[PDB]
Protein backbone atom coordinates (compact mmCIF):
# COMPACT_ATOMS: atom_id res chain seq x y z
CA UNK A 1 0.00 0.00 0.00
CA UNK A 2 2.92 2.28 0.78
CA UNK A 3 6.37 2.97 -0.69
CA UNK A 4 9.03 0.43 0.24
CA UNK A 5 11.14 2.76 2.49
CA UNK A 6 7.98 3.23 4.58
CA UNK A 7 8.42 -0.29 5.96
CA UNK A 8 12.05 0.32 6.80
CA UNK A 9 11.13 3.55 8.58
CA UNK A 10 8.24 1.83 10.35
CA UNK A 11 10.45 -0.87 11.83
CA UNK A 12 13.40 1.40 12.69
CA UNK A 13 10.94 3.63 14.58
CA UNK A 14 9.32 0.63 16.29
CA UNK A 15 12.67 -0.63 17.65
CA UNK A 16 13.96 2.79 18.70
CA UNK A 17 10.75 3.47 20.65
CA UNK A 18 11.07 -0.01 22.23
CA UNK A 19 14.47 0.93 23.54
CA UNK A 20 13.21 4.24 24.91
CA UNK A 21 10.08 2.91 26.63
CA UNK A 22 11.96 -0.09 27.98
CA UNK A 23 13.83 2.47 30.01
CA UNK A 24 10.85 4.77 30.76
CA UNK A 25 8.60 2.01 32.16
CA UNK A 26 11.15 0.89 34.78
CA UNK A 27 13.02 4.11 35.55
CA UNK A 28 11.14 5.42 38.62
CA UNK A 29 11.10 1.95 40.21
CA UNK A 30 14.82 1.63 39.42
CA UNK A 31 15.45 4.94 41.25
CA UNK A 32 13.49 3.77 44.30
CA UNK A 33 14.57 0.15 44.53
CA UNK A 34 18.03 0.12 43.01
CA UNK A 35 19.47 3.54 43.93
CA UNK A 36 17.53 3.88 47.16
CA UNK A 37 15.82 7.16 46.24
CA UNK A 38 12.71 8.12 48.14
CA UNK A 39 9.58 8.29 46.00
CA UNK A 40 9.78 12.12 45.99
CA UNK A 41 13.45 12.14 44.81
CA UNK A 42 12.60 9.51 42.16
CA UNK A 43 9.62 11.52 40.86
CA UNK A 44 11.46 14.83 40.53
CA UNK A 45 14.49 13.11 38.96
CA UNK A 46 12.23 11.39 36.45
CA UNK A 47 10.70 14.81 35.72
CA UNK A 48 14.15 16.26 35.03
CA UNK A 49 15.10 13.37 32.75
CA UNK A 50 11.84 13.71 30.81
CA UNK A 51 12.27 17.48 30.51
CA UNK A 52 15.72 17.01 28.93
CA UNK A 53 14.61 14.18 26.63
CA UNK A 54 11.77 16.37 25.40
CA UNK A 55 13.52 19.75 25.19
CA UNK A 56 16.54 18.49 23.30
CA UNK A 57 14.36 17.19 20.41
CA UNK A 58 14.85 20.66 18.84
CA UNK A 59 18.52 19.86 18.11
CA UNK A 60 18.00 16.86 15.86
CA UNK A 61 15.90 18.64 13.25
CA UNK A 62 18.61 21.27 12.78
CA UNK A 63 21.46 18.73 12.72
CA UNK A 64 19.59 16.63 10.14
CA UNK A 65 18.44 19.59 7.98
CA UNK A 66 21.55 21.74 7.88
CA UNK A 67 24.69 20.03 9.32
CA UNK A 68 24.94 16.32 8.47
CA UNK A 69 21.81 15.22 6.64
CA UNK A 70 18.77 13.21 7.74
CA UNK A 71 20.18 9.75 6.98
CA UNK A 72 23.58 10.39 8.59
CA UNK A 73 21.81 11.81 11.63
CA UNK A 74 19.55 8.75 11.94
CA UNK A 75 22.74 6.65 12.04
CA UNK A 76 24.52 8.94 14.54
CA UNK A 77 21.46 9.26 16.79
CA UNK A 78 20.89 5.50 16.85
CA UNK A 79 24.54 4.97 17.81
CA UNK A 80 24.48 7.55 20.62
CA UNK A 81 21.21 6.07 21.91
CA UNK A 82 22.54 2.50 21.90
CA UNK A 83 25.65 3.66 23.74
CA UNK A 84 23.39 5.28 26.33
CA UNK A 85 21.39 2.10 26.86
CA UNK A 86 24.55 0.00 27.36
CA UNK A 87 25.95 2.65 29.71
CA UNK A 88 22.75 2.39 31.69
CA UNK A 89 23.23 -1.38 31.84
CA UNK A 90 26.80 -0.74 32.97
CA UNK A 91 25.57 1.62 35.71
CA UNK A 92 24.78 -1.48 37.73
CA UNK A 93 28.55 -2.17 37.95
CA UNK A 94 29.30 1.59 38.30
CA UNK A 95 26.33 3.36 39.95
CA UNK A 96 28.19 6.69 39.59
CA UNK A 97 27.57 6.42 35.84
CA UNK A 98 23.76 6.58 35.99
CA UNK A 99 23.24 10.28 35.24
CA UNK A 100 25.82 10.32 32.44
CA UNK A 101 24.09 7.33 30.89
CA UNK A 102 20.71 9.01 31.08
CA UNK A 103 22.17 12.21 29.68
CA UNK A 104 23.56 10.17 26.83
CA UNK A 105 20.09 8.84 26.11
CA UNK A 106 18.58 12.32 26.21
CA UNK A 107 21.12 13.73 23.79
CA UNK A 108 20.78 10.64 21.61
CA UNK A 109 16.99 11.00 21.51
CA UNK A 110 17.49 14.66 20.84
CA UNK A 111 19.57 13.90 17.78
CA UNK A 112 17.22 11.20 16.43
CA UNK A 113 13.50 11.88 17.11
CA UNK A 114 12.74 14.32 14.33
CA UNK A 115 14.60 12.59 11.60
CA UNK A 116 12.66 9.40 10.65
CA UNK A 117 9.42 11.39 10.32
CA UNK A 118 11.24 13.86 8.09
CA UNK A 119 12.55 10.97 6.03
CA UNK A 120 9.07 9.46 5.76
CA UNK A 121 7.75 12.76 4.42
CA UNK A 122 10.27 12.56 1.58
CA UNK A 123 9.08 9.08 0.55
CA UNK A 124 5.89 10.51 -0.94
CA UNK A 125 5.26 13.08 -3.71
CA UNK A 126 4.23 16.31 -2.03
CA UNK A 127 0.42 16.09 -2.20
CA UNK A 128 0.12 12.29 -2.17
CA UNK A 129 -3.20 11.21 -0.59
CA UNK A 130 -1.58 8.25 1.21
CA UNK A 131 0.45 10.61 3.40
CA UNK A 132 -2.20 10.84 6.13
CA UNK A 133 -2.50 7.07 6.45
CA UNK A 134 1.27 6.63 6.36
CA UNK A 135 1.73 9.03 9.26
CA UNK A 136 -1.12 7.45 11.19
CA UNK A 137 0.72 4.14 10.75
CA UNK A 138 3.93 5.88 11.82
CA UNK A 139 2.30 6.84 15.13
CA UNK A 140 1.01 3.27 15.44
CA UNK A 141 4.57 2.02 14.88
CA UNK A 142 5.69 4.18 17.82
CA UNK A 143 2.94 2.76 19.99
CA UNK A 144 3.55 -0.87 19.07
CA UNK A 145 7.14 -0.43 20.18
CA UNK A 146 5.99 1.34 23.34
CA UNK A 147 3.33 -1.33 24.00
CA UNK A 148 5.87 -4.12 23.79
CA UNK A 149 8.43 -2.31 25.96
CA UNK A 150 6.02 -1.15 28.66
CA UNK A 151 4.52 -4.65 28.80
CA UNK A 152 7.71 -6.72 28.90
CA UNK A 153 10.44 -4.51 30.34
CA UNK A 154 9.13 -4.65 33.99
CA UNK A 155 8.72 -8.41 33.67
CA UNK A 156 12.25 -8.76 32.28
CA UNK A 157 13.71 -6.59 35.04
CA UNK A 158 11.91 -8.63 37.69
CA UNK A 159 13.09 -11.97 36.30
CA UNK A 160 16.64 -11.18 35.09
CA UNK A 161 17.63 -7.77 36.49
CA UNK A 162 18.07 -4.28 35.13
CA UNK A 163 21.37 -4.92 33.33
CA UNK A 164 19.55 -7.36 31.04
CA UNK A 165 16.62 -4.95 30.51
CA UNK A 166 18.89 -2.07 29.55
CA UNK A 167 21.16 -4.25 27.38
CA UNK A 168 18.04 -5.41 25.58
CA UNK A 169 17.17 -1.75 25.04
CA UNK A 170 20.62 -1.36 23.50
CA UNK A 171 20.04 -4.46 21.39
CA UNK A 172 16.77 -3.03 20.10
CA UNK A 173 18.66 0.04 18.95
CA UNK A 174 21.33 -2.13 17.33
CA UNK A 175 18.72 -3.96 15.31
CA UNK A 176 17.15 -0.62 14.35
CA UNK A 177 20.61 0.36 13.08
CA UNK A 178 21.03 -2.95 11.24
CA UNK A 179 17.65 -2.56 9.58
CA UNK A 180 18.57 0.93 8.47
CA UNK A 181 22.02 -0.05 7.13
CA UNK A 182 20.61 -3.16 5.45
CA UNK A 183 17.95 -0.98 3.80
CA UNK A 184 20.15 2.08 3.02
CA UNK A 185 19.63 1.34 -0.68
CA UNK A 186 15.91 2.15 -0.46
CA UNK A 187 16.52 5.80 0.44
CA UNK A 188 19.49 6.70 -1.81
CA UNK A 189 17.56 9.58 -3.44
CA UNK A 190 15.70 10.49 -0.20
CA UNK A 191 17.28 12.99 2.14
CA UNK A 192 17.92 16.56 3.07
CA UNK A 193 20.39 18.62 1.07
CA UNK A 194 23.51 17.78 3.20
CA UNK A 195 22.90 14.05 2.67
CA UNK A 196 23.96 14.48 -0.96
CA UNK A 197 27.18 16.47 -0.45
CA UNK A 198 30.17 14.66 1.16
CA UNK A 199 30.14 14.83 4.95
CA UNK A 200 31.82 17.90 6.51
CA UNK A 201 34.11 16.71 9.29
CA UNK A 202 34.20 20.20 10.73
CA UNK A 203 30.44 20.10 11.33
CA UNK A 204 30.49 16.48 12.54
CA UNK A 205 33.16 17.37 15.11
CA UNK A 206 31.10 20.38 16.18
CA UNK A 207 28.13 18.04 16.60
CA UNK A 208 30.07 15.46 18.65
CA UNK A 209 31.65 18.18 20.86
CA UNK A 210 28.25 19.76 21.49
CA UNK A 211 26.76 16.33 22.18
CA UNK A 212 29.35 15.53 24.88
CA UNK A 213 29.04 18.95 26.53
CA UNK A 214 25.28 18.40 26.61
CA UNK A 215 25.63 14.88 28.05
CA UNK A 216 27.57 16.42 30.94
CA UNK A 217 25.19 19.37 31.37
CA UNK A 218 22.21 16.95 31.40
CA UNK A 219 23.90 14.73 33.97
CA UNK A 220 24.48 17.74 36.19
CA UNK A 221 20.95 19.12 35.86
CA UNK A 222 19.44 15.72 36.62
CA UNK A 223 21.70 15.38 39.66
CA UNK A 224 20.74 18.90 40.90
CA UNK A 225 17.06 19.40 40.11
CA UNK A 226 17.18 22.54 42.27
CA UNK A 227 19.13 24.26 39.52
CA UNK A 228 17.10 22.79 36.70
CA UNK A 229 14.18 24.46 38.50
CA UNK A 230 15.72 27.95 38.52
CA UNK A 231 17.32 27.63 35.09
CA UNK A 232 13.94 26.81 33.58
CA UNK A 233 12.11 29.35 35.76
CA UNK A 234 14.28 32.31 34.77
CA UNK A 235 14.66 31.07 31.20
CA UNK A 236 10.88 30.66 30.98
CA UNK A 237 9.96 34.06 32.43
CA UNK A 238 12.60 35.66 30.22
CA UNK A 239 11.47 33.93 27.04
CA UNK A 240 7.90 34.89 28.02
CA UNK A 241 9.03 38.53 28.10
CA UNK A 242 10.81 38.17 24.76
CA UNK A 243 7.66 36.60 23.32
CA UNK A 244 5.53 39.45 24.69
CA UNK A 245 7.64 42.29 23.27
CA UNK A 246 7.71 40.94 19.71
CA UNK A 247 -2.45 38.29 16.53
CA UNK A 248 -2.28 34.62 15.33
CA UNK A 249 0.63 34.07 17.82
CA UNK A 250 -1.50 34.79 20.91
CA UNK A 251 -3.44 31.68 19.88
CA UNK A 252 -0.15 29.83 20.15
CA UNK A 253 0.44 31.35 23.61
CA UNK A 254 -2.86 30.28 25.13
CA UNK A 255 -2.59 26.90 23.36
CA UNK A 256 0.96 26.60 24.75
CA UNK A 257 -0.29 27.07 28.32
CA UNK A 258 -2.95 24.44 27.63
CA UNK A 259 -0.31 22.11 26.16
CA UNK A 260 1.70 22.66 29.36
CA UNK A 261 -1.24 21.44 31.46
CA UNK A 262 -1.58 18.46 29.13
CA UNK A 263 2.06 17.52 29.60
CA UNK A 264 1.89 17.91 33.38
CA UNK A 265 -0.88 15.32 33.27
CA UNK A 266 0.86 12.97 30.78
CA UNK A 267 3.90 12.99 33.03
CA UNK A 268 1.93 11.20 35.79
CA UNK A 269 1.77 7.89 33.93
CA UNK A 270 5.31 6.67 34.83
CA UNK A 271 5.21 8.25 38.30
CA UNK A 272 2.10 8.82 40.43
CA UNK A 273 -0.25 6.64 38.33
CA UNK A 274 2.45 3.97 38.20
CA UNK A 275 2.78 3.87 41.99
CA UNK A 276 -0.98 4.08 42.39
CA UNK A 277 -1.28 0.89 40.36
CA UNK A 278 1.48 -0.62 42.55
CA UNK A 279 -0.06 0.32 45.88
CA UNK A 280 -3.85 0.44 45.53
CA UNK A 281 -4.92 -1.69 42.56
CA UNK A 282 -5.40 -5.46 42.28
CA UNK A 283 -2.55 -7.04 40.32
CA UNK A 284 -4.90 -9.44 38.49
CA UNK A 285 -7.11 -8.88 35.45
CA UNK A 286 -9.21 -11.49 33.56
CA UNK A 287 -7.67 -14.05 35.90
CA UNK A 288 -4.03 -13.37 34.87
CA UNK A 289 -1.49 -11.95 37.33
CA UNK A 290 0.67 -9.11 36.02
CA UNK A 291 3.42 -6.79 37.13
CA UNK A 292 1.57 -3.52 37.96
CA UNK A 293 4.40 -1.45 36.34
CA UNK A 294 3.21 -2.99 33.03
CA UNK A 295 -0.07 -1.12 33.49
CA UNK A 296 1.74 1.84 31.85
CA UNK A 297 1.39 -0.19 28.62
CA UNK A 298 -2.32 0.60 28.66
CA UNK A 299 -1.49 4.01 27.09
CA UNK A 300 0.06 2.74 23.82
CA UNK A 301 -2.46 -0.10 23.89
CA UNK A 302 -5.42 2.28 23.66
CA UNK A 303 -3.63 4.41 21.08
CA UNK A 304 -3.00 1.37 18.90
CA UNK A 305 -6.68 0.49 18.93
CA UNK A 306 -8.04 4.01 18.76
CA UNK A 307 -5.82 5.76 16.18
CA UNK A 308 -7.34 3.85 13.20
CA UNK A 309 -10.92 4.37 14.44
CA UNK A 310 -10.38 8.09 15.02
CA UNK A 311 -8.66 8.39 11.62
CA UNK A 312 -11.84 6.97 10.07
CA UNK A 313 -14.01 9.44 11.97
CA UNK A 314 -14.82 22.64 15.87
CA UNK A 315 -11.58 21.82 13.88
CA UNK A 316 -8.50 22.89 15.86
CA UNK A 317 -9.49 24.65 19.13
CA UNK A 318 -12.40 22.30 19.74
CA UNK A 319 -10.17 19.24 19.32
CA UNK A 320 -7.87 20.69 22.00
CA UNK A 321 -10.89 21.32 24.22
CA UNK A 322 -12.11 17.72 23.78
CA UNK A 323 -8.67 16.32 24.62
CA UNK A 324 -8.58 18.40 27.79
CA UNK A 325 -12.05 17.16 28.89
CA UNK A 326 -10.99 13.56 28.28
CA UNK A 327 -7.89 14.01 30.45
CA UNK A 328 -9.91 15.63 33.22
CA UNK A 329 -12.24 12.61 33.18
CA UNK A 330 -9.33 10.18 33.44
CA UNK A 331 -8.23 11.75 36.70
CA UNK A 332 -11.74 12.18 38.09
CA UNK A 333 -12.25 8.48 37.34
CA UNK A 334 -9.07 7.63 39.24
CA UNK A 335 -10.31 9.70 42.16
CA UNK A 336 -13.77 8.14 42.03
CA UNK A 337 -12.41 4.58 42.00
CA UNK A 338 -10.44 5.38 45.11
CA UNK A 339 -13.24 7.23 46.90
CA UNK A 340 -16.14 4.83 46.37
CA UNK A 341 -15.15 1.57 44.66
CA UNK A 342 -12.29 0.24 46.78
CA UNK A 343 -11.98 -2.95 48.84
CA UNK A 344 -12.14 -3.18 52.57
CA UNK A 345 -8.38 -3.74 52.35
CA UNK A 346 -7.92 -0.55 50.25
CA UNK A 347 -7.54 -2.03 46.75
CA UNK A 348 -9.48 -1.10 43.63
CA UNK A 349 -10.42 -3.06 40.51
CA UNK A 350 -7.94 -2.71 37.62
CA UNK A 351 -10.87 -2.02 35.25
CA UNK A 352 -10.90 1.45 36.72
CA UNK A 353 -7.27 1.91 35.67
CA UNK A 354 -8.11 0.53 32.20
CA UNK A 355 -10.67 3.33 31.99
CA UNK A 356 -8.28 6.02 33.34
CA UNK A 357 -5.80 5.06 30.63
CA UNK A 358 -8.48 5.03 27.90
CA UNK A 359 -9.53 8.61 28.79
CA UNK A 360 -5.90 9.73 28.93
CA UNK A 361 -5.06 8.12 25.57
CA UNK A 362 -8.04 9.77 23.87
CA UNK A 363 -6.78 13.06 25.25
CA UNK A 364 -3.40 12.27 23.71
CA UNK A 365 -4.99 11.49 20.35
CA UNK A 366 -6.88 14.83 20.35
CA UNK A 367 -4.18 17.16 21.68
CA UNK A 368 -0.56 16.17 21.08
CA UNK A 369 -0.79 15.28 17.39
CA UNK A 370 -3.38 17.94 16.61
CA UNK A 371 -1.34 20.65 18.31
CA UNK A 372 1.79 20.19 16.20
CA UNK A 373 -0.29 20.73 13.04
CA UNK A 374 -1.88 23.78 14.69
CA UNK A 375 1.63 25.02 15.44
CA UNK A 376 2.56 24.21 11.78
CA UNK A 377 -0.58 26.01 10.51
CA UNK A 378 -0.66 29.20 12.65
CA UNK A 379 3.00 30.21 12.27
CA UNK A 380 9.31 30.03 13.44
CA UNK A 381 12.49 28.66 15.02
CA UNK A 382 11.93 30.95 18.02
CA UNK A 383 8.44 29.60 18.61
CA UNK A 384 9.83 26.07 18.35
CA UNK A 385 12.44 26.99 20.97
CA UNK A 386 9.91 28.57 23.33
CA UNK A 387 7.62 25.60 22.85
CA UNK A 388 10.28 23.04 23.68
CA UNK A 389 11.52 25.06 26.62
CA UNK A 390 8.04 25.36 28.13
CA UNK A 391 7.02 21.77 27.54
CA UNK A 392 10.25 20.56 29.12
CA UNK A 393 9.30 22.83 32.00
CA UNK A 394 5.94 21.08 31.95
CA UNK A 395 7.65 17.72 32.56
CA UNK A 396 9.60 19.21 35.50
CA UNK A 397 6.34 20.58 36.86
CA UNK A 398 4.83 17.15 36.38
CA UNK A 399 7.53 15.50 38.49
CA UNK A 400 6.90 18.08 41.20
CA UNK A 401 3.13 17.51 41.04
CA UNK A 402 3.70 13.78 41.35
CA UNK A 403 5.61 14.31 44.61
CA UNK A 404 2.31 15.08 46.33
CA UNK A 405 1.52 11.32 46.05
CA UNK A 406 4.95 10.15 47.28
CA UNK A 407 4.74 7.35 49.89
CA UNK A 408 7.40 6.82 52.59
CA UNK A 409 9.13 3.46 52.41
CA UNK A 410 7.83 2.30 55.80
CA UNK A 411 4.11 2.59 54.90
CA UNK A 412 2.54 -0.80 54.19
CA UNK A 413 -1.24 -0.27 54.55
CA UNK A 414 -3.27 0.46 51.36
CA UNK A 415 -5.89 2.32 53.42
CA UNK A 416 -3.26 4.95 54.23
CA UNK A 417 -2.15 5.52 50.64
CA UNK A 418 -5.64 5.39 49.07
CA UNK A 419 -6.79 8.84 50.34
CA UNK A 420 -3.52 10.56 49.30
CA UNK A 421 -3.85 9.30 45.72
CA UNK A 422 -7.57 10.18 45.63
CA UNK A 423 -7.08 13.73 46.97
CA UNK A 424 -4.35 14.52 44.44
CA UNK A 425 -6.02 12.83 41.46
CA UNK A 426 -9.38 14.44 42.28
CA UNK A 427 -7.90 17.91 42.54
CA UNK A 428 -5.93 17.42 39.31
CA UNK A 429 -9.17 16.35 37.63
CA UNK A 430 -11.08 19.38 38.97
CA UNK A 431 -8.39 21.88 37.87
CA UNK A 432 -8.18 20.27 34.45
CA UNK A 433 -11.99 20.47 34.20
CA UNK A 434 -11.81 24.21 34.87
CA UNK A 435 -9.05 24.53 32.26
CA UNK A 436 -11.19 22.62 29.77
CA UNK A 437 -14.11 25.02 30.42
CA UNK A 438 -12.10 28.18 29.84
CA UNK A 439 -10.79 26.49 26.71
CA UNK A 440 -14.40 25.90 25.59
CA UNK A 441 -15.34 29.54 26.24
CA UNK A 442 -12.43 30.71 24.13
CA UNK A 443 -13.00 28.09 21.41
CA UNK A 444 -15.17 30.55 19.33
CA UNK A 445 -12.80 33.52 19.67
CA UNK A 446 -9.84 31.21 19.00
CA UNK A 447 -11.63 29.77 15.95
CA UNK A 448 -12.18 33.30 14.61
CA UNK A 449 -8.49 34.20 15.01
CA UNK A 450 -7.37 31.24 12.87
CA UNK A 451 -9.04 32.80 9.79
Amino acid at each position, epitope marked *: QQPRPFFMIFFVELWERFGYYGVQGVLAVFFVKQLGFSQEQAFVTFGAFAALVYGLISIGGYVGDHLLGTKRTIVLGALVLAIGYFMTGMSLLKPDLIFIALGTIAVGNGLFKANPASLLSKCYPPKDPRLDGAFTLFYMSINIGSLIALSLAPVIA*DRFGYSVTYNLCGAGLIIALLVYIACRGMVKDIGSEPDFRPMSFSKLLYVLLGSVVMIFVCAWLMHNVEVANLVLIVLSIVVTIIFFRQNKMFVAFVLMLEAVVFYILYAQMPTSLNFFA*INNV*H*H*EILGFSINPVSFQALNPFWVVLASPILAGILSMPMKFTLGMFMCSLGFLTAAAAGMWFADAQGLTSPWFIVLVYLFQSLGELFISALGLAMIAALVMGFILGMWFLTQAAAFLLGGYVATFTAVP*D*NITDPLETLPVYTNVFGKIGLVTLGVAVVMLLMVPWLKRMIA
Partner: nanobody
Framework: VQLVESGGGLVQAGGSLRLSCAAS????????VGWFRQAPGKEREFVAG???????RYKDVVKGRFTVSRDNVKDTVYLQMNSLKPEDTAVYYC?????????????????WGQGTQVTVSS
Protein backbone atom coordinates in the same frame (compact mmCIF):
# COMPACT_ATOMS: atom_id res chain seq x y z
CA VAL B 1 6.34 -16.95 41.51
CA GLN B 2 6.41 -20.05 43.63
CA LEU B 3 7.49 -19.67 47.23
CA VAL B 4 8.85 -22.55 49.28
CA GLU B 5 8.19 -22.38 53.02
CA SER B 6 10.34 -24.27 55.46
CA GLY B 7 10.86 -24.63 59.19
CA GLY B 8 7.51 -25.51 60.72
CA GLY B 9 6.95 -28.34 63.13
CA LEU B 10 5.94 -29.21 66.66
CA VAL B 11 7.02 -27.15 69.67
CA GLN B 12 6.02 -26.62 73.27
CA ALA B 13 4.40 -23.47 74.63
CA GLY B 14 6.96 -20.76 75.24
CA GLY B 15 9.28 -22.17 72.59
CA SER B 16 10.44 -20.72 69.27
CA LEU B 17 10.43 -21.54 65.56
CA ARG B 18 11.73 -19.88 62.42
CA LEU B 19 9.83 -20.02 59.18
CA SER B 20 11.55 -19.14 55.96
CA CYS B 21 10.19 -18.28 52.54
CA ALA B 22 12.33 -18.56 49.44
CA ALA B 23 11.21 -17.81 45.92
CA SER B 24 12.11 -19.74 42.79
CA UNK B 25 12.13 -17.63 39.59
CA UNK B 26 11.81 -13.91 40.35
CA UNK B 27 13.97 -12.29 42.98
CA UNK B 28 11.88 -11.71 46.13
CA UNK B 29 13.45 -8.21 46.51
CA UNK B 30 10.58 -6.47 44.65
CA UNK B 31 7.95 -8.12 46.86
CA UNK B 32 6.16 -7.49 50.05
CA VAL B 33 6.02 -10.91 51.69
CA GLY B 34 3.13 -11.50 54.07
CA TRP B 35 2.73 -14.47 56.40
CA PHE B 36 -0.79 -15.83 56.74
CA ARG B 37 -2.04 -18.62 58.93
CA GLN B 38 -5.08 -20.87 58.89
CA ALA B 39 -6.12 -22.63 62.09
CA PRO B 40 -8.58 -25.57 62.02
CA GLY B 41 -12.03 -24.34 60.99
CA LYS B 42 -11.17 -20.68 60.42
CA GLU B 43 -10.06 -18.42 57.56
CA ARG B 44 -6.53 -17.49 56.50
CA GLU B 45 -5.56 -14.40 58.44
CA PHE B 46 -2.68 -11.96 58.07
CA VAL B 47 0.05 -12.61 60.62
CA ALA B 48 3.02 -10.49 59.72
CA GLY B 49 4.92 -9.08 56.78
CA UNK B 50 7.76 -7.08 55.32
CA UNK B 51 7.45 -4.85 52.22
CA UNK B 52 10.00 -4.32 49.48
CA UNK B 53 11.70 -1.46 51.38
CA UNK B 54 11.81 -2.77 54.96
CA UNK B 55 8.39 -1.54 56.15
CA UNK B 56 6.77 -3.99 58.58
CA ARG B 57 3.19 -4.90 59.50
CA TYR B 58 1.87 -7.12 62.33
CA LYS B 59 -1.34 -8.61 63.64
CA ASP B 60 -2.07 -7.37 67.17
CA VAL B 61 -1.88 -10.76 68.91
CA VAL B 62 1.67 -11.48 67.67
CA LYS B 63 3.38 -8.12 68.37
CA GLY B 64 6.20 -8.53 70.85
CA ARG B 65 6.45 -12.24 70.01
CA PHE B 66 6.93 -12.54 66.20
CA THR B 67 9.57 -10.77 64.10
CA VAL B 68 9.59 -10.64 60.27
CA SER B 69 12.88 -9.99 58.60
CA ARG B 70 14.51 -10.26 55.25
CA ASP B 71 17.90 -11.54 54.21
CA ASN B 72 18.36 -9.66 51.00
CA VAL B 73 21.56 -11.51 50.00
CA LYS B 74 20.11 -15.03 50.47
CA ASP B 75 16.80 -13.77 48.95
CA THR B 76 14.83 -15.12 51.89
CA VAL B 77 12.11 -13.88 54.21
CA TYR B 78 12.02 -15.09 57.80
CA LEU B 79 9.38 -15.30 60.49
CA GLN B 80 10.96 -15.69 63.94
CA MET B 81 8.26 -16.96 66.31
CA ASN B 82 9.06 -16.70 70.06
CA SER B 83 6.87 -17.17 73.17
CA LEU B 84 4.73 -19.61 71.19
CA LYS B 85 1.24 -20.44 72.46
CA PRO B 86 -1.21 -23.29 71.68
CA GLU B 87 -3.50 -20.83 69.90
CA ASP B 88 -0.74 -20.17 67.37
CA THR B 89 -1.33 -23.68 65.95
CA ALA B 90 -2.07 -23.40 62.22
CA VAL B 91 -0.91 -23.93 58.69
CA TYR B 92 1.37 -20.98 57.88
CA TYR B 93 1.66 -19.60 54.31
CA CYS B 94 3.94 -17.02 52.78
CA UNK B 95 2.49 -14.81 50.06
CA UNK B 96 4.15 -12.26 47.79
CA UNK B 97 2.82 -9.02 46.28
CA UNK B 98 4.82 -6.61 44.12
CA UNK B 99 5.70 -3.32 45.86
CA UNK B 100 5.43 -1.60 49.22
CA UNK B 101 1.93 -2.58 50.36
CA UNK B 102 0.93 -5.44 52.71
CA UNK B 103 -2.85 -5.81 52.40
CA UNK B 104 -4.66 -7.72 55.15
CA UNK B 105 -6.67 -10.15 53.00
CA UNK B 106 -5.40 -13.10 50.89
CA UNK B 107 -6.91 -11.57 47.73
CA UNK B 108 -4.18 -8.91 47.80
CA UNK B 109 -1.46 -11.49 47.02
CA UNK B 110 -0.85 -13.41 43.82
CA UNK B 111 1.87 -15.87 44.83
CA TRP B 112 1.49 -18.47 47.56
CA GLY B 113 3.66 -21.09 49.16
CA GLN B 114 2.11 -24.44 49.92
CA GLY B 115 2.03 -24.07 53.71
CA THR B 116 3.94 -25.44 56.73
CA GLN B 117 2.14 -26.92 59.77
CA VAL B 118 3.04 -25.29 63.10
CA THR B 119 1.79 -27.03 66.26
CA VAL B 120 2.28 -25.63 69.76
CA SER B 121 1.59 -28.08 72.58
CA SER B 122 0.70 -27.07 76.10
Amino acid sequence: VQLVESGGGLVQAGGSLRLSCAASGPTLSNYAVGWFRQAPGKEREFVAGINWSSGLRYKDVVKGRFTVSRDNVKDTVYLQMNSLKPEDTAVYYCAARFGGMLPLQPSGYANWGQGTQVTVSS
